[PDB]
Amino acid sequence: RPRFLWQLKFECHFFNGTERVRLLERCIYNQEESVRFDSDVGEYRAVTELGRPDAEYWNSQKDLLEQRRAAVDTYCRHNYGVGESFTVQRRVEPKVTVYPSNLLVCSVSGFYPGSIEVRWFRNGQEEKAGVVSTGLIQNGDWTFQTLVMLETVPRSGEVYTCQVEHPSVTSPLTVEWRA
Amino acid sequence: EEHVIIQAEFYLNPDQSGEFMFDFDGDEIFHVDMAKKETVWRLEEFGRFASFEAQGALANIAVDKANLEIMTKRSNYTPITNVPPEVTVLTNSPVELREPNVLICFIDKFTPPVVNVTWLRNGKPVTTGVSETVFLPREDHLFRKFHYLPFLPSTEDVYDCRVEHWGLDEPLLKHWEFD
Amino acid sequence: GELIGILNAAKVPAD
């Protein structure tokens, strides 16, 4: 039995906080984007023929344009401000453990936000070669996780260090694994 | 690019499903419960720093639903092509026996936003402690969604996220066990 | 606390 879907998305794109801001208003019918308002262009543009009549109608409503063109300040920058303290400046400390899966796994879980640097050290010295990662996984509850793996046969008496740098710590976190 | 705030709305016929949500870098800030007509924050503490007047969302949905109807006739009732989900099961943090944890069922890259999802423990349904996100937007205009099941890690137990979607031939069953 | 702002859904042309 057939389905029909309409999507409307107002996207506020922020470059360096609120210095450069772009507004993207998108209408999507069954997975196909048909018409958009891009603050960079300053009027509605049909993406597909489906959306052509909507671009022409909306471009002739002067009030609507005037309003959208100021939304970059009235809407985008406004919401950024309302939400700064619990979105942009949200910080959760990663929980870092190291176990052998040979292959040494560094798990880094429960952190926010998404920018992180994970490094491995064999006896206090870097190991960029042999490093396998899952990539950044978004948990859906405002925490990320990642698992970073090192291919090495562990010779006992050696030290392996998982080093993790993250906006939630001033100096980096290191977990060691010996013998 | 640094950050993205998205006000995302959708309407699906003939199901008559409506959703209105705010997304920050891919995480939900809140969504509007259409039935109870109230703002539901993804994390309870967001309700301290911020408010949203739900009546504005209801208005947008009405318009979205009228737009969809007109748009449906213009496309001569072209229905949406089902796009089946990808499904990954994974845990909150690294699993340990007798230490509490959470199963995450991540459902991604599907369209029409309708799924039916059950967790099975040793082949049988579980619903104790379960929770779920609403449907979340993607840049290719498909959807993501998360299902959560708190559990006590054990050596016997096999778990399944069972996902039903019209884009699939048989329910997709995704294995997880503690090894 | 402080109020989040909304953009209104534009009505597509009738008929």
Partner: T-cell receptor, first 108, second 109 residues
Framework: GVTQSPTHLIKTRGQQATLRCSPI?????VYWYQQALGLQFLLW???????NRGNFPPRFSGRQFPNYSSELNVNALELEDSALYLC??????????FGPGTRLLVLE | IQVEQSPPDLILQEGANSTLRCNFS?????LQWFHQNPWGQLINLFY???GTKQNGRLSATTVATERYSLLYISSSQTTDSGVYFC????????????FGRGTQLTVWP
């Protein structure tokens, strides 16, 4: 233009009033405002439905008809209810156009 | 939520120029200026969220980030007499204008 009836109305404390409004043809939204002793917002209708409502007792109530004209109805009138009641139509979040008002006086 | 107008009233002689001001305490999707004649008819002068607009002897400027609007009356005229309102379409509330208290203007010949 937006029209309103009636132009004036006198009412005794405790009676009830019905005010009428027609939006500009093409406009599908209707707004009621009260101007007493700067305007205060009462109610908003679009496509027959109460979309929103200001800070007024349930005594104040209304509705919009399928042809988009609307009725504001006030019920256990008080001396304080004396005001110019203004009606406006518009496309949502665009310019508002106002009718000539109903000048309503409530006396003892 | 709060909308301050200045001044509260004003008397001009025909030909004089002035500036009516409006200050507001939150982000505002759009801002509108009205003239209200003694009978009570409101007339829209400007829909202006940002920038500068001219219509004849009237012009207006809205600076959205700073949250004010100025209304310029060049070469004033007896017919300009009445009350001038800025009203404000608060970005977080759909379908509602919030009015200031007005600036009463009287222009004598």
């Amino acid at each position: 233009g937006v029209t309103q009836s009636p132009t004036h109305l006198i009412k005794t404390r405790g009676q009830q009033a019905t005010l009428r409004c027609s939006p500009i043809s093409g406009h599908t939204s209707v707004y009621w405002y009260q101007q007493a002793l700067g305007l205060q917002f009462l109610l908003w209708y679009d496509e027959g439905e109460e979309r929103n409502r200001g800070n007024f007792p349930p005594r104040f109530s209304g509705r919009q008809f399928p042809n988009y004209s609307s009725e504001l109805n006030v019920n256990a009138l008080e001396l304080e209810d004396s005001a110019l009641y203004l009606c406006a139509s518009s496309q949502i979040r665009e310019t508002q156009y106002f009718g000539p008002g109903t000048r309503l006086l409530v006396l003892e | 939520i709060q909308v301050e107008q200045s001044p509260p009233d004003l008397i001009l002689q025909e030909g004089a120029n002035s500036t009516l001001r409006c200050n507001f305490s939150d982000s505002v999707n759009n801002l509108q200026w009205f003239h209200q004649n003694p009978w009570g008819q409101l007339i829209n002068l400007f829909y202006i969220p940002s920038g500068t607009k001219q219509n004849g002897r009237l012009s207006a400027t809205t600076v959205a980030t700073e949250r004010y609007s100025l209304l310029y009356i060049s070469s004033s005229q007896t017919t300009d007499s009445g009350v001038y309102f800025c009203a404000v379409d608060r970005g977080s509330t759909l379908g509602r204008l919030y009015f200031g208290r007005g600036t009463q203007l009287t222009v004598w010949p």
